[PDB]
UniProtKB/Swiss-Prot annotation, chains A, B:
Family note: Belongs to the WD repeat SEC13 family.
Miscellaneous information on this protein: Present with 952 molecules/cell in log phase SD medium.
Protein name: Nucleoporin SEH1
Main location: nucleus
Keywords on record: Membrane, mRNA transport, Nuclear pore complex, Nucleus, Phosphoprotein, Protein transport, Repeat, Translocation, Transport, Vacuole, WD repeat
Role: Functions as a component of the nuclear pore complex (NPC). NPC components, collectively referred to as nucleoporins (NUPs), can play the role of both NPC structural components and of docking or interaction partners for transiently associated nuclear transport factors. Involved in nuclear poly(A)+ RNA export and NPC biogenesis. It is also required for normal nuclear morphology. Component of the SEA complex which coats the vacuolar membrane and is involved in intracellular trafficking, autophagy, response to nitrogen starvation, and amino acid biogenesis.
Example GO biological process: protein transport
Subunit relationships: Component of the nuclear pore complex (NPC). NPC constitutes the exclusive means of nucleocytoplasmic transport. NPCs allow the passive diffusion of ions and small molecules and the active, nuclear transport receptor-mediated bidirectional transport of macromolecules such as proteins, RNAs, ribonucleoparticles (RNPs), and ribosomal subunits across the nuclear envelope. Due to its 8-fold rotational symmetry, all subunits are present with 8 copies or multiples thereof.
Metal-binding among keywords: no
GO CC annotation terms, alphabetical: nuclear envelope; nuclear membrane; nuclear pore; nuclear pore outer ring; Seh1-associated complex; vacuolar membrane
GO molecular function terms noted in the UniProt entry: structural constituent of nuclear pore
InterPro entries with a match to the protein in the record: Sec13/Seh1_fam, WD40/YVTN_repeat-like_dom_sf, WD40_repeat_dom_sf, WD40_rpt
Length: 300, 300
């Protein structure tokens, strides 16, 4: 496994795998979004297309279920999110390979993270800004991938900083989204009235929460969501749903001695990864007792 | 005087100065057009914008009188010409700084050279392809810089190769254009009937004619047009207009020992430049007798 030049002139922020894990979409402070392709023949990655996406620094990215087309979404410090439908009949390395399906100017403050809701709910997406306001967009009509409406607009809290969020993958559980603002982590669920509500919180954080992601509850009903905190501790919670949610603290690991920056899940929720200051990446597996044990560690 | 990276991945073809000689528009086989700006403060040139223009190799370029906007025109081996109106309210180095005002697909063969007619005739342009067919386009209406019509369509000769052309700058002389195809050089003039006609030819060429340009007849009535030939000889003709044209051969210089590739005029038709295989560029001035004498020589 050999690295490769992202090609970015300024520090890189997010890297997201498309559905089939064939491509990865980069994005950094150089205001450019880059999609790379994994060559079937040679095990090498090569730039599919780079192009100025936003005017300020870009920080988040996420693809949308191939059942809705090839739509990469992006958020930036320019206080606005942009969508991009890939143009199959184009060139590569050109810059005319992706178009602004639209632009979400509503956020009256710099955005930090945007993720597409699970496909079974439709073509929806959430995004959290610095104004501490959650915003849910969705092209009510899948045919015109250009007009997105404002579903919900909840406000988290004050702005005296780090953010991020992750929906609940499981297609067989009532819609819900977990958002984390600073030293907080709150779970939201859809109501009988079709409006969002605060279903529970993940207690225990002492510093800002660098990363949080929900896990694919494949084969199980109890949900699982991991936390990468600034204090240097990974946390795995077990949310069971009988107010009707129970939040359990399963594990907790300091193994990193620094700050947990990125915490990520397997595609079947079998493995969990944790990266931090100690420049190492630990992967975790679950026990029959459901406590988490690290299986391996990569370094630098 | 220090050079600078054109930035082109493949050999460069044409470089044209805009009206006020502030910018220069490059174009090479890497299918990219690049406009450079001359910094007032520091005597250095720096890239204004690069962008894939054509699909094949680009070979010619030419600006249009600022009185018609900022329109750069380009011809390529993709058998079609494209126009580009600069977007003042954009970025630089982006790629979204110039738009395809239109595209001239008519040429049923790879194009070689395209030059805008003088401003006093309107917003017109000529272009010569490999099919040996001259084509004159012009947005009959200056307001919509997107619809160009087909004025004239003359055919030069067979296709058993090099081409190029140059209009007659002078605002006080009846419209005319000099085109050169291979070992030929023909002058065309507008007729009483508004259709083109062959007014005269420049005799004397033994090989292909690399470059030909008409001179600014400022202060004089007799016209002057220079020839850069493959045989390695510059030729300066004196066309006086009383059929009504007289063609005189003024000078002839072998000083280059190779091939005259590029022959260019001053903005007042006071100096003439000749570049060729001998990697030197000679500049010529006229005598009181009107014979031409080289005044200086640059090299490598």
């Amino acid at each position: 496994m050999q690295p490769f030049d992202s090609g970015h002139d300024d520090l890189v922020h997010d890297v997201v795998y498309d559905f089939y894990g064939r491509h990865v979409a980069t994005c950094s402070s150089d205001q450019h979004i880059k999609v790379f392709k994994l060559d079937k023949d040679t095990s090498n990655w090569e730039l599919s297309d780079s192009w100025r996406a936003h005017d300020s620094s870009i920080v988040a990215i996420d693809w949308a279920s191939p059942e809705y087309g090839r739509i990469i979404a992006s958020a930036s410090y320019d206080k606005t999110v942009k969508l991009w439908e890939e143009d199959p009949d184009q060139e590569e390395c050109s810059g005319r390979r992706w178009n602004k399906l639209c632009t979400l100017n509503d956020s009256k403050g710099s955005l930090y993270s945007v993720k597409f809701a699970p496909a079974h709910l439709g073509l929806k997406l959430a995004c959290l800004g610095n104004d501490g306001i959650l915003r849910l967009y969705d092209a009510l009509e899948p045919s015109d991938l250009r007009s997105w409406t404002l579903t919900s607009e909840m406000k988290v809290l004050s702005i005296p900083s780090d953010f991020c969020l992750s929906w609940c993958p499981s297609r067989f559980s009532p819609e819900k989204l977990a958002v984390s603002a600073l030293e907080q982590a709150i779970i939201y669920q859809r109501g009988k009235d079709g409006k969002l509500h605060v279903a529970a919180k993940l207690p225990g954080h002492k510093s800002l929460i660098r990363s949080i992601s929900w896990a694919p509850s494949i084969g199980r009903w109890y949900q699982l969501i991991a936390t990468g905190c600034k204090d240097g501790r990974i946390r795995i919670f077990k949310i069971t749903e009988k107010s009707n949610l129970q939040v359990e603290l399963l594990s907790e690991h300091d193994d990193h001695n620094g700050e947990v920056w990125s915490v990520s899940w397997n595609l079947t929720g079998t493995i969990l990864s944790s990266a931090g200051d100690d420049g190492k990446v630990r992967l975790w597996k679950a026990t029959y007792s459901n406590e988490f044990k690290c299986m391996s560690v990569i370094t630098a």
